Design a protein. Structure first.
Length: 191
């Protein structure tokens, strides 16, 4: 998770879609959903990203409705956004044991216990954090079984992007889990 602000320049698809849902948190605007194969995915927007500006308007104080309204009205030949990278998240690097474990239990995406003497304990993995990404792959919406598969079919070094449950809960609110399982970009990023 960069400590970095960055500009992205977007262009609507032939359907006038960018593939984004925004959500208002603590008088910021945060990315609730990046759609697979969208402009939003292509410029590299991620779950949990803060939108500081849209076309050089500050987003501070907007409803999620006003954020979505603004998007709709943009002469969207070209859309500029100032992004703060995933401010509510942190990345932890672990190494599997010979048993092939990093050493935690999760339920519905959320870490619930740390196993003693483990790489998770050594790196201070916290419980009551939801798992947002795994080796830069968004895994939000996926079943527990599929998350477990991605951890199985990884190298010895594992990278996990976590977010405090209470913050995760407040972001995803008013999004059908199915839509996030169905449409939340779970792809490895293009180059
Ligand atoms: F499984 C769920 C149950 C309720 C809301 C969302 C999900 C998606 N799964 C998830 C959560 N954190 N990471 C992955």
């Amino acid at each position: 998770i960069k400590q970095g602000i960055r500009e992205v320049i977007l262009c609507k698809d032939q359907d006038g879609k960018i593939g984004l849902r925004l959500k208002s948190i603590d008088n910021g605007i945060f990315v609730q959903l990046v759609q697979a194969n969208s402009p939003a995915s292509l410029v590299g927007l991620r779950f949990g990203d803060q939108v500081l500006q849209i076309n050089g308007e500050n987003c501070a104080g907007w409803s999620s409705d006003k954020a979505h309204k603004v998007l709709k009205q943009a002469f969207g030949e070209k859309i500029t956004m100032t992004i703060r990278d995933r401010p509510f998240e942190r990345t932890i690097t672990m190494h599997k044991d010979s048993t092939g474990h990093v050493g935690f239990i999760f339920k519905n995406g959320k870490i619930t216990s740390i196993v003693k003497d483990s790489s998770a304990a050594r790196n201070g993995l916290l419980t009551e954090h939801n798992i947002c990404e795994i080796n830069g792959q968004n895994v939000i919406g996926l079943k527990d079984s599929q998350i477990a598969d991605i951890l199985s079919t990884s190298g010895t070094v594992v990278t996990i992007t976590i977010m405090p449950a209470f913050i995760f809960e407040h972001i995803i609110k008013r999004m059908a889990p199915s839509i996030m399982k169905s449409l939340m970009d779970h792809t490895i990023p293009e180059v």
